[PDB]
């Protein structure tokens, strides 16, 4: 039989230190093709090893299609996934505001994806921690739900080696994280989840008011904040993202402020679990 492997790369939709992401076409169908830099080859190996161990399939996890290694004169490393034309949550929040139903649908879908990663199923799948959760690593689907992307730093029950500094938990910044305990990595994801919840909630309209899109800690650290910049804010001063007064006039944003506080405790073991966040979100509105 013919094995059709040609992908037409149509347009570059992302460029960074990691390499590039392209919208591509395979057999009439849109795919996303991540082309890894030599700098970030370990992310391709980790994601590939994870998918070789467990073929994750979940509506709120970016859908795997293929991992390709091709010999050149160098080695070319591609990861091929489903394509989400609306782009990342980061991209989407810049222009778009949200109503109550759209805000809740986004954050419950992220909680659903994250709980699916975290849970060991004994049938099944090992427990997985993401280790780089942020709004750029979440894609928006046409049905209003999101999916979690980029398992290049994921751990299974370290890696390329640290996550995005702006989203690092206090125990990562102060180097107290108990690195031999798998639950430690789940708790780091919950911290980052809380920051994403804050980024989304700001864009939910209430009483004719909305906040502009800002990244977590926009008001206390520079662009491309250093490790030290983040440690001083999060660990030494114990600062947390601001909850605007206008949220306390809206029952949904009041409930979301309480949830994000319960993701941001200095004590990692005090933070809510992804399953408890899902349950809380299903009872809001
Ligand atoms: C190698 O490389 C790539 C391959 C493909 C691809 C193209 N056509 C058909 C296939 C296919 C799938 C599954 C079977 C089964 C049939 C039942 N039998 C009992 C076991 C085997 C055969 C063939 C594939 C996997 C796409 C790619 O990109 C999207 C590839 O990557 C470049
Ligand atoms: C990698 O990705 C894609 C692959 C394909 C594709 C192409 N040829 C054959 C297959 C296939 C056929 C049959 C089996 C099974 C059937 C039951 N039992 C006998 C074991 C073997 C598996 C695989 C597929 C899945 C299509 C896709 O999209 C339409 C893909 O997505 C881009
Ligand atoms: C995060 O991680 C990965 C993401 C993807 C991915 C999948 N669907 C769609 C996208 C996308 C499409 C389009 C835009 C637009 C936004 C508006 N404007 C700025 C021009 C461009 C942004 C994003 C991406 C980037 C694939 C991946 O691997 C193949 C990823 O890595 C695992
Ligand atoms: O790039 C790396 O360091 C990884 C390759 C496979 S295992 C370690
Ligand atoms: O086990 C889980 O939590 C996943 C099943 C479908 S939704 C999440």
DSSP letter string over 74-123? -EEEEEEE---TT-BHHHHHHH--B-HHHHHHHHHHHHHHHHHHH--B--
Q: Is 248 helix (H, G, I), strand (E, B) or coil?
A: helix
Token digits for 202? 């700001």
Find out whether the beta carbon of 13 lies less than 6 Å from any atom of ligand 3.
Answer: yes
Residues belonging to the active site: 132
CA 266 to chain centre: 21
Q: Cβ distance 93 to 213 under 8 Å?
A: yes
81 CB less than 6 Å from ligand 3? yes
Listed in sequence order, the residues at least 6 apart from 80 whose beta carbon sits closer than 8 Å to its beta carbon are 7, 24, 26, 31, 32, 33, 34, 65, 66, 67, 68
- The enclosing H or E element of 138 equals strand 138-140
Q: Taking the chain, what is the end-to-end CA distance rounded to the nearest angstrom?
A: 53
Resolution of the structure in the document, Å: 1.3
Q: Distance between CA atoms of 134 and 136, rounded to whole angstroms?
A: 6
β-sheet bridge partners, residue 148: 61, 138
- CA-nearest residue for atom 5, ligand 5, is 116
Quick one: 245 exposed, middle or buried, by C-beta within 10 A (0-12, 13-18, 19+)?
exposed
Which DSSP letter does residue 219 get? Answer: T
Q: Report the C-alpha gap between 61 and 78 in whole angstroms.
A: 18
Q: How many CB atoms lie within 10 A of CB 167?
A: 26
CA atoms of 152 and 185, how far apart (whole Å): 14
Ligand 2 centroid, distance to 46 Cα (angstroms): 24
- Nearby residues of 116 by Cβ (< 8 Å), 6 or more positions away: 56, 58, 60, 61
State residue 178 phi and psi, 5-degree precision.
Answer: -80, 95
Cα gap 130→56, rounded to integer Å: 13
CA–CA dist 153, 160 (Å, integer)? 6
3-state secondary structure of 73: coil
The pairs formed by 97-100 with CB atoms below 8 angstroms and a separation of 24 or more are 97/203, 97/204, 97/205, 97/210, 98/200, 98/203, 98/204, 98/205, 99/204, 99/205, 100/204, 100/252, 100/285
């Amino acid at each position: 039989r013919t094995v059709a492997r040609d992908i037409t790369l149509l347009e570059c939709v992302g460029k960074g230190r990691y390499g590039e992401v392209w919208r591509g076409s395979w057999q009439g169908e849109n795919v996303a093709v991540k082309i890894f830099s030599s700098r970030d080859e370990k992310s391709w190996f980790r994601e590939t090893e994870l998918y070789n161990t467990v073929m994750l399939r979940h509506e709120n996890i970016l859908g795997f299609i293929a991992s390709d290694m091709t010999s050149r004169h160098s080695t070319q490393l591609w990861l091929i996934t489903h394509y989400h034309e609306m782009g990342s949550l980061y991209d989407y929040l810049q222009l778009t505001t949200l109503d109550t139903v759209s805000c809740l649908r986004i954050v419950l879908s992220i909680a659903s994806g994250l709980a699916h990663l975290h849970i060991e199923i004994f049938g099944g799948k090992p427990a997985i921690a993401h280790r780089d959760l942020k709004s750029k690593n979440i894609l928006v689907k046409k049905n209003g739900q999101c999916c979690i992307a980029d398992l290049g730093l994921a751990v299974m029950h370290n890696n390329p080696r640290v996550g995005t500094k702006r989203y690092m938990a206090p125990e990562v910044l102060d180097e107290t994280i108990q690195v031999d305990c798998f639950d430690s990595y789940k708790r780091v994801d919950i911290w980052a989840f809380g920051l994403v919840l804050w980024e989304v909630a700001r864009r939910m309209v209430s009483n004719g008011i909305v906040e502009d899109y800002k990244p977590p800690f926009y008001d206390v650290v520079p662009n491309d904040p250093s490790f030290e910049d983040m440690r001083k804010v999060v660990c030494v001063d114990q600062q947390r993202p601001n909850i605007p007064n206008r949220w306390f006039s809206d029952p949904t944003l009041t409930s979301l402020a309480k949830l994000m506080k319960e993701c941001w405790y200095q004590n990692p073991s005090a933070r809510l679990t992804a399953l408890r966040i899902k349950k809380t979100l299903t009872k809001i509105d």
